[PDB]
Amino acid sequence: TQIVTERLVALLESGTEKVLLIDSRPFVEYNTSHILEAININCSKLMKRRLQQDKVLITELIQHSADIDCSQKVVVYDQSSQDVASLSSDCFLTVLLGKLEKSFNSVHLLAGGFAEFSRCFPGLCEG
Amino acid sequence: TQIVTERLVALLESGTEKVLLIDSRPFVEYNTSHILEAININCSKLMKRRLQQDKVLITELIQHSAKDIDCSQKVVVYDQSSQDVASLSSDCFLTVLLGKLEKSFNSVHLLAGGFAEFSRCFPGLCEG
């Protein structure tokens, strides 16, 4: 589903849940700046081929970037996507979202993407 | 400012104005699919360095990639889903780009809803 900015700060701040946070954006963007300890599965020619080719175990990929577990809350974000319906049918994010919902019961998109989180919580963004 | 999906289709369809249409998105995305005859100034490490380094004439860049410039010319940038200029993270690629473009054209508008919304509403006007 979706999960809004304030929910994400709440989960991040507490220990309540172990949150797996993915930054789907291009490498440059991730590198400029990202949400603290987000994992860069970057929008890439290679990354996109390998996702949709199904040559990649998403859980191995997660490790190759950084504790995995399907109940684990997962939050993907791009720069500004509001919700799942407003994704172009064959965009990178979409490709990704599939393979992730193919491993986790809890996959939520960050409403407002990184533009909105970084606007509201500058201090919780590493760069 | 902003320019919404239906304005863009209107300008594209008519000859009223010669529209310069830029797809700011990563190369993969542009390649998967884009608005007919948009020019890919792709969100890149190189592209971003060169923009903000000011090593690039934006107008020369346009013509590299294309395959008629003129500052009055309507220019429309888009990413995947940005709604408006205020909702851009201060130092994101788009933003960088928007500067260098407003530094060459009087008419630079962002496509409200980005490519997600145009491609939803006008599938046939997207090459892939």
All structural domains of chain A: 1-127 (3.40.250.10)
Q: Does A94 touch chain B (CB under 8 A)?
A: no
Q: How far, in Å, CA of A40 to CA of A34, rounded?
A: 9
Distance of CA B74 to the CA centre of its chain: 11
Q: How far, in Å, CA of B11 to CA of A39, rounded?
A: 41
Q: Does B81 touch chain A (CB under 8 A)?
A: yes
Instruction: Provide φ and ψ at A35, rounded to 5°.
Output: -70, 140
Pairing of strands A39-40, A125-126: unpaired
Question: To one decimal place, what's the resolution in Å?
Answer: 2.7
Separation in Å, CA B104 to CA A6, A57, B18, B62:
39, 46, 16, 12
Residues of B in contact with A79 (CB under 8 A): 79-82, 89, 92, 94
- Method underlying the structure: X-ray
Q: Which of A127, A31, A52, A126 is nearest to A96 (CA)?
A: A52
3-state secondary structure B52-117: HHCCCCHHHHHHHHCCCCCCCCEEEEECCCCCCCCCCCCCCHHHHHHHHHHCCCCCEEEECCHHHH
- Give the distance from residue A78's alpha carbon to the nearest chain B alpha carbon, in angstroms: 9
